């Protein structure tokens, strides 16, 4: 008999490539010849790096995900030595190879591919996931030239009040703060990478490239890149906004969706709140047994959601760039103004601040956990409610001579009292003691 | 079905697998690029196996070994029920790692390296209450907040012994920016 | 045919559906001075604020502009003398003298509770504000009003068949009060106007000139401008002088006719974002007042 390497009825063949974690091999069905992509993850190698939780979360996300521009995960086969991830196979290969072969991608096809990439990116961000490794090498193409993002890894979840500092990605596609090794929010980091992809599609070159690595990162931090004469004035402004050095000034998916160049020939089924989206995409919200293509109440929720979403100015405020005012607007106090600040600010030494924090907490009978020299997990038992109030303290650097102590509530387990009031009162006690 | 992977990482131009399940008979392994593999359907329990590389008996040193009474050194792999379900397998890999403590009123000792607090993210300075909402909108309304500034405290400078605190909290898909005027 | 379609709608929708995506809530500690609290309502642009008792560790009540009216009318003496009670009283000290022989517990709603329950609660307790408190965390999420309920219902009128009452006139349906209408003259002092809002518990007083025409309206909301302009110490001034600040960007008193259909009254109230309209006949003689309280009581509770 032949020594054919078989896994879950699939015959393993040539290696398609090596990702951030694991080896990817082609799989063809023993009976039909159906092609799949099998990512093999060595169990001991996962234990050796202590990224079990990362692999566990990576599998969880790819199972839930359902998007036409993200590589679909069919099944995971567990063996005593390895993990076999059976995925959707795409014959077209890397977008990087397509850009190289044609030298430069035409405006019509470049926009079509970018619209698909941004749709897949928006799906991840709405599902609290950030890829952190967007590049034409990680963007695959199907027989019908449709872009499907892949190589989830070097990626992490997005939680409320938390930031990500891990430096992930290739230097040419990494944002200025990743290069700098600074804390960041998830979405603007992926948008910078998409900006480089759009530049690479339309030009066939990188906006920030150099042989000398320190010069390359100086180029990224400076944000100075060539805008060739063949690029139209409209697409030039989009690239300039997406590749903005300042993350607060940087373009959002909402800004790109509104941009005149991006809007052209954009299908009505790619983004939410679009005429064809509600009719072509199944809402995750399930209300346990599944009933499809049979009469009866899911669409009633879809209709009700559409009315409320259409009714803007009712659920959200409209920031200003004649106009009737609201009858309940109240006049200014009499020529008086006030400004809010994030936290108590000190100009003294970092350990001088921390020593005062420990002295203030012990006088207030607080119980704390030392996570980092500048990061604590503080607790206090409320006497009336008989519950525990949890919060997180973190010292940051505002400027070279200026510091800040950040206060953040821990949402875990107050029916008798109030969780938000418990946090404010715990903060007020600490601020007053520090004087 | 119960698949078990037998991968020979070492060098060689000819590699055979011989184990207790094959009654110590030489099974040929197909090569890719210095990788001789075979996937076999095997039941639960301990299995003694060895490799026959280029006409010589050898073992994989990266795997457990059970030496026989006559000095026969061969590898052993124990098939486990947990090894076939991925979540169960990952559950074991977390426990096997074996790599913070209780709530204490003791201050943390100064770092031996001694280095600097992290640079404040620009996203946190985007104060929601310092922004104008427009005359037409209901004054109670606010714009959609960034997830990174949620659960974070924001305060006003103490005037006449009254402290004003604020934080943006999220209930389901909706957000609330609670303000509290509390005299000290 | 079913006239209970709006009743079934209110019973099916939770209070959560009305809460905005992003909104602000102002909370006051019961130990805070009322003058500071009334000034804080202006600087934050809010009419009402839930009260937090730190000793009991529970939400006790609400501080509205009605509390300011009640403080001014009870303690004002002259424009020559300071109102010591407004200048020195704490929220807790004021709540003790107001709830004396008339104590009141906290009237609230859960975000999981139906809107039918919220509308019923507002009518039964004769209130305008209703705090939405989550029973899990104990946090006050939003201050629910009549304006919010009707504007939400207005978005869904095209989703269900309109009942026969919508196509019927206000005279045939008899919605609103048409007897003993509380009004003020153009020269009426502010202190007098405050005395009528307490004695009658009404939210607005139409301003009528000596000839007999309704030039302006004096709402409970307009009273908070006395704190904003810091003109609360002089209540001898006329209501015309008190409303002089809004002379610009004011079309006039929003009125409605008895012959006009209920549907057009609701649309006009939702578009203007106001609490009430003055009812007049074809002859234009004032017939009465139609507030959202009368609208919601007729569309939700009566079927
Ligand atoms: C006719 C023919 O050529 N048949 C086949 C011969 C063998 C083939 C083959 C099929 C699968 C494997 C395989 N390769 C594995 N690599 C594993 O761990 C890794 C994963 C990723 C990397 C980068 C490494 C590594 O460090 O080399 C090891 N586990 C593995 C488990 C298996 Cl079963 C190795 C070779 C493919 C075609
Ligand atoms: C650096 N890029 C490579 C290109 C290559 O291998 C990688 C490592 C990278 O892709 C992200 N790999 C690909 C995929 C994969 C998934 C997870 C992690 C890394 C991955 C799949 C998934 N289905 C695809 O068919 C298939 C595809 C793959 N690669 C290919 C080369 C040619 C044809 C298909 C492939
Ligand atoms: N100025 C007024 N005079 C007499 N009744 C009024 C006046 N304003 C409102 N009402 C009535 O009082 C009730 C509640 O008033 P409101 O505070 O506007 O909700 C309703 O039945 C109104 O019709
Ligand atoms: N019918 C009306 N015509 C004109 N202004 C009104 C009317 N009803 C209320 N207002 C104004 O609307 C504002 C809010 O008051 P309220 O409607 O009680 O919330 C106040 O400044 C009132 O003077």
Numbering used by the authors:
A (entry chain A): 7 to 293, 304 to 312, 323 to 347, 362 to 374, 397 to 475, 530 to 551
B (entry chain B): 77 to 175, 184 to 198, 201 to 270
C (entry chain E): 24 to 326
Task: Paste lines from the article.
To structurally characterise the MSG011/AMPK interaction and investigate chemistry for blocking β1 binding we solved the co-crystal structure of activated α2β1γ1 (phosphorylated on α2-Thr172 and β1-Ser108) in complex with MSG011 at a resolution of 2.95 Å. As expected, MSG011 was docked in the ADaM site where clear electron density was observed for the drug in both AMPK heterotrimers in the asymmetric unit. Both MSG011 molecules were built in similar poses, however, missing electron density around the 2-methylbenzoic acid indicates flexibility in this region. Interestingly, α2-Lys29 is in close proximity to this ring and was unable to be completely modelled due to poor electron density around the ε-amino group, hence it is plausible that it is participating in both hydrophobic interactions with the 2-methylbenzoic acid of MSG011 through the hydrophobic carbon tail, and hydrogen bonding with phosphorylated β1-Ser108 through its positively charged ε-amino group. There is also flexibility around the acetamido group, which was modelled in different conformations in each heterotrimer. This chemical group is not present in previously published ADaM site-directed activators and occupies a novel space at the entrance of the ADaM site, however it does not appear to interact with any AMPK residues that are resolved in this structure. MSG011 differs from the α2 selective SC4 only in the LHS terminal ring, with addition of an acetamido and loss of aromaticity and a 2-hydroxyl group. We previously showed that the SC4 2-hydroxyl forms hydrogen bonding with α2-Lys31, suggesting that loss of this interaction confers MSG011 with the ability to activate all AMPK complexes, and conversely that the 2-hydroxyl group is important for α2 selectivity of ADaM site compounds.
AMP-activated protein kinase (AMPK) is a conserved serine/threonine protein kinase that acts as a metabolic fuel sensor and is crucial for maintaining cellular energy homeostasis. It is a heterotrimer composed of a catalytic α subunit, an N-terminally myristoylated regulatory β subunit and a nucleotide-sensing γ subunit, each with multiple isoforms (α1, α2, β1, β2, γ1, γ2, γ3) providing the potential to form 12 distinct complexes. The capacity of AMPK to monitor cellular energy status is provided by three exchangeable adenine nucleotide binding sites on the γ-subunit. Biochemical and structural analyses reveal that many of these direct activators bind to a hydrophobic pocket located between the AMPK α kinase domain and β carbohydrate binding module (CBM), termed the Allosteric Drug and Metabolite (ADaM) site, as it can also be occupied by regulatory endogenous metabolites such as palmitoyl-CoA.
